[PDB]
Every structure is written in structure tokens, then in C-alpha cells.
Amino acid sequence: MELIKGQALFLELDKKDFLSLKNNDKNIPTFAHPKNQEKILAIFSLPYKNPPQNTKLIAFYKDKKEEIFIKTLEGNYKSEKLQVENKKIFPPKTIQERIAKELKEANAIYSSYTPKALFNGAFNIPLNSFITSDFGKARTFNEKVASYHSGTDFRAATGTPIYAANSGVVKIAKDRYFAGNSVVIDHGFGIYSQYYHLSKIDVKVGQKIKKGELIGLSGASGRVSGPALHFGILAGGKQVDPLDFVSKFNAIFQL
Ligand SMILES: CC(=O)N[C@@H](CCC[C@@H](NC(C)=O)C(=O)O)C(=O)N[C@H](C)C(=O)NO
Ligand SMILES: [Zn+2]
Fold it and tell me: Which of 27, 193, 210, 248 has its CA 20 to 30 A from that of 237?
């Protein structure tokens, strides 16, 4: 199979006699195919930065092992040279500690696997706008990726209502350094939607929300380049192309 870096893939496996899906010694979780009773599904995601060239997954069955080969593709991402390699910046210690703290909290939430569907049918777009900056737009030095856009920016004047892309449980609902006023929703199966730079948060941690329910107001919080909604998807442990993901998910769970 082939997969563009920074994208997710839905692997289809036979259910009967299935034991384990493995990436070397890492376990990949599985969930029901919602239409085909004989199949299960796994989410496999490639990181945008420094992906392997090739992956081998092994589905272990009681009666057999099946190897899955995935070739990593570069895709057609927008990319710009910078002319300063200053990878080590010297923030104030207050900033350094807030970032490290918020990183630790995020890692703990994305670690808490929900082995159940919290969602309800297809993902909606969180507002009726258009993309102003694409997922995966890269900054390069040494023909190497130094940084990338890890979600997608929607056109939103300050105070635009933002609605939950799908049902789930709010796990983050506060002000963070890089994301500003942030909402993060667990949808189950390690799938998380992310709404950043909000001017107002209308949900609390641990709240069950419904698809199309108000989660806050768009803003420019934490945003140098002006007001927008930043929308992200974390799936299979990685930030992935969110409209590509929503499209692949919806093809499976719409009906
Ligand atoms: C690096 C990147 O392109 N986008 C994300 C980071 C991904 C979410 C994840 N990490 C943090 C720090 O929150 C989490 O821990 O939940 C961001 O915060 N702002 C970007 C610059 C933007 O482009 N705004 O428009
Ligand atoms: Zn963004």
C-alpha cells in the first residue's frame, strides 16, 4: 500500500481469529467495521516530519500471520526555504515551563485510549467557511523539514461560532501557549479533533458534546497572523491532514 506522510489510513482486516496488529513491538488498536460484520479496522498514521520510508505491520491470527507493507509518499505539499537555521530559541523560563507543562498534559490525554465510538455518523466541518492555510505547508532548510502546519486554517472573523465536528468528550478547554484558547474532543478510537485560537470557550473538561453543538467563538488567541479557526485531527498517535481524514472516515461511517 502507499500513504502520504501526515495522513491516516483505515486498514481493513478479517475479524475471525484475529489476535494482534503490530508495528515492531508497538500494538495498533482495532474497532468494528460498521457495515461489514466479518471485518475490523485499524488507523495507521505516518508522521509529517521524519517518517520511515517503509512500514511493515503484522496482523497475528490464531492460524496465520499477514504482513502489511506501506510505502511512505512525499505528496504535493506547499513548501518554502527559510534563510535562518536557528533551531534553538531562548524563551523566558516562564514560557519554557508553560510549554513543557502543556506538552506533558497533552501527551497524557492522547495516551488515554477510548476503546468505543463516542462519535455519531460522519464528521461535519466545524463552520461553513473555506481554507485560508492548508495542512502540511512546510518550512525547509538543507532541503529538510524544519516545521509544518499541523492542522488547517478556516476563514473566521473574531467571534464566529464554532461547532463540534462530531460527538465526543471534551478533554481540553483552556488557554495554552501555542494553541491559545483550545478545545480538544475525544471521539473514541484515539481520534481527537482540535479547535485553536478561540476568543471564547463554551465547554468544560469532561463534558459530552453532540455533533453540531457550539464549542466556542473563533478568535486570534495565540495567533500572530490574525483571526482564523485552526482545526486539527490527531489519529493513530499523529497530527494528520484533517479534511483527508474526515473524507476517509466519512466514506466508512456516514450511513
Ligand atoms: C505546529 C503547528 O502547525 N500547529 C499546532 C500544534 C498541534 C497541536 C498539539 N500541539 C500544541 C502545541 O498544541 C496539541 O498538543 O494538542 C499549533 O498549535 N499552532 C500552529 C503553529 C498554527 O498554525 N496556527 O494557525
Ligand atoms: Zn493553523
Answer: 210
Cα torsion 229, 156, 119, 248 to 10°: value is: -80
Mutate which of 95, 150, 192, 193 for ligand 1? The one with the most ligand atoms within 8 Å of its CB, which is 150
Distance of alpha carbon 104 from alpha carbon 128, whole angstroms? 33
Q: Identify the DSSP state of 128.
A: S
Residues with CB under 5 A from ligand 2 (ion): 153, 230
Max Cα–Cα distance, the chain, nearest Å = 58
Edge-to-edge, what's the strand order for the sheet holding 26-28?
2-4, 65-73, 54-61, 18-23, 26-28
Collect all residues with Cβ–Cβ distance below 8 Å to 144 and sequence separation of at least 6: none
Task: Tell me whether strands 138-141 and 229-235 are parallel, antiparallel or unpaired.
Answer: unpaired
Give the integer Cα–Cα distance in Å for 239 and 59: 24
Q: What is the dihedral of CA 237, 241, 244, 247, to 10 degrees?
A: 60
Pick the residue whose CA is nearest to atom 12 on ligand 1: 178
Give the Cα separation of 46 and 57 in Å (integer). 13
SS3 31: strand
Ramachandran region, residue 242 (left: φ > 0; alpha: ψ -120 to 50; beta: rest): alpha
Q: Please tell me the distance from the alpha carbon of residue 218 to that of residue 181, in angstroms, as a whole number.
A: 9
The C-alpha atoms of residue 222 and residue 180 are separated, in whole angstroms, by 4
